Amino acid sequence: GEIEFIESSKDAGFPVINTPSKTKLEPSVFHQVFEGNKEPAVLRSGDPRLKANFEEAIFSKYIGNVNTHVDEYMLEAVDHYAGQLATLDISTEPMKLEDAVYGTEGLEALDLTTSAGYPYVALGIKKRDILSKKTKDLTKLKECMDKYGLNLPMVTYVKDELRSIEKVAKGKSRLIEASSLNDSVAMRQTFGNLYKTFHLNPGVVTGSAVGCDPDLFWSKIPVMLDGHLIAFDYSGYDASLSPVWFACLKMILEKLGYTHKETNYIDYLCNSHHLYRDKHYFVRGGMPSGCSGTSIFNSMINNIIIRTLMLKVYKGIDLDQFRMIAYGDDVIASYPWPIDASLLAEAGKGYGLIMTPADKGECWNEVTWTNVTFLKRYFRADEQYPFLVHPVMPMKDIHESIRWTKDPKNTQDHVRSLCLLAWHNGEHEYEEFIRKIRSVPVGRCLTLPAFSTLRRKWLDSF
């Protein structure tokens, strides 16, 4: 992806978008009881923790585009992946408006707490002013979509989240795009059945884990990925994507039966128009993370990418024995024979992708079931039921999360969610976690699940 044109918003009649200046993250009551290093990401240029220029840093992931056409390796990758998706009988019929907006099996209702995008954000019109969970009203939405149309600018926000010491100092805060409510709804109508099918079928046919439940999905992963593991990191996957990869995605969707007209929204994602504060700018390439479907579309492109790289380096590869699962940029994969991921990474560089060893490792080491991670979680077979696999979020990450809060009124839900992650680290670690929680008076006011209850419910879920 590449920023192609920037101008002052006032020169085009756009008002300044007044987005937050302060973080909503504050130290929690557990901030002293636990250790951590992360702090809220930089949100503004004058932040005293900066050791770099903020605005250059947040837009630096737009590293440019490689300008090639769809080549022979991409074509075969698209064909192979299309054959897999064909077995799922994805409907290309539009999803009915009430289902696309207010919820159906496999597609949660449109999130009413996130930004309504342009022009609503400049008019004081929130999603709740248009939509109604209680009534499922569609009449105001119909009025708004008729009045303001489609293909509206995206609004760029800086993500308010905890980041490492290094990412705070370098100002490398993440950007999230808000599609206009109008475009979010239209994309959910166009692709909602695809979204539903992916959410309902995480695994090695979709090549997707979007919407998975790690407590359950984890025991399936080693059954599906029964060869030599392949894993690696991307640097700035979304913004690195060149238009050629969106062309590949359009080819895949048309093989699924979408019309050329129905794939036009992929052009809306690839060649995009944005408002950031007082600026208005155009981008060619890059996935605008936060628009409708970007996790699923990133995952589908990743399925095309890895197959392309394998075909290009290993002529004679048999993709019918390759298996992979992606969640956006995050990939875990396997092949019955060893594969040199450093060769893949060099092939990736030729396509404008930045690939490095898994989990910030220094060398291209062997990926094993002991050291592999997916969605930041390790894989640990249960001692007693060895066919059941614990997803293991490191306690370090649980400690980082519990030390901050965006709303202490939600303390009970926050801590309980962390308990559901922590107990997979074993009973001694969970006991210690609970004890430290309870060393603060708030902690003894909370309903915390017992280790044995967590284990019993997990075992019973299978």
3-state secondary structure 271-289: EEEEEECCEEEEEECCCCE
Output the six-digit token pair for 372.
């592999």
213 marked ligand binding residue: no
Compute the Cα dihedral for 109, 114, 117, 119 and give only its sign. positive
Give the chain's end-to-end CA distance (angstroms, integer): 43
Residue 394, beta-bridge partner list: none
Q: Which CATH architecture has domain 213-242+293-368?
A: 2-Layer Sandwich (3.30)
CB 415 within 8 A of CB 402: yes
- Return d(Cα 282, Cα 284) in angstroms, integer: 7
Helix (H) or strand (E) run with residue 302 in it: helix 294-313
Contact (CB, 8 A) for 173 and 23 = no
- Please name which of 308, 312, 331, 335 lies closest in space to residue 323, comparing C-alpha atoms: 335
Alpha helices in 95-234 (DSSP H): 97-102, 127-130, 139-148, 165-169, 181-200, 214-217, 221-224
**Is 193:90 a contact under the CB 8 Å cutoff?**
yes
Distance set, CA 449 to CA 184, 331, 389, 395, 442 (Å)? 38, 32, 21, 17, 15
Cα separation of 377 and 390, whole Å? Answer: 9
- Whether 430 contacts 422, CB under 8 Å: yes
C-alpha neighbours within 13 Å on the C-beta side of residue 346: 7
Architecture of the 376-462 domain:
Up-down Bundle (1.20)
**Phi, psi angles (nearest 5°) of residue 344:** -55, -45
Distance from C-alpha of 427 to C-alpha of 423, rounded to nearest angstrom: 7
Could you tell me which residues come within 8 angstroms of residue 103 by beta carbon, excluding any fewer than 6 positions away?
Answer: 109
> Are the CB atoms for 235 and 218 separated by under 8 Å?
no
d(CA 380, CA 38): 26
Region of 20 please: left (phi>0), alpha (psi -120 to 50) or beta: beta
Q: How many Cβ atoms from other residues are within 10 Å of residue 2's Cβ?
A: 17
Q: What is residue 104's three-state secondary structure?
A: strand
For residue 46, the SS3 value is: coil
Has 226 been labeled as part of a binding site? no
Give the integer Cα–Cα distance in Å for 128 and 133.
Answer: 9
CA dist 148 and 302 (Å) reads 34
Give ranges for CATH 3.30.70.270 in the chain. Answer: 213-242+293-368
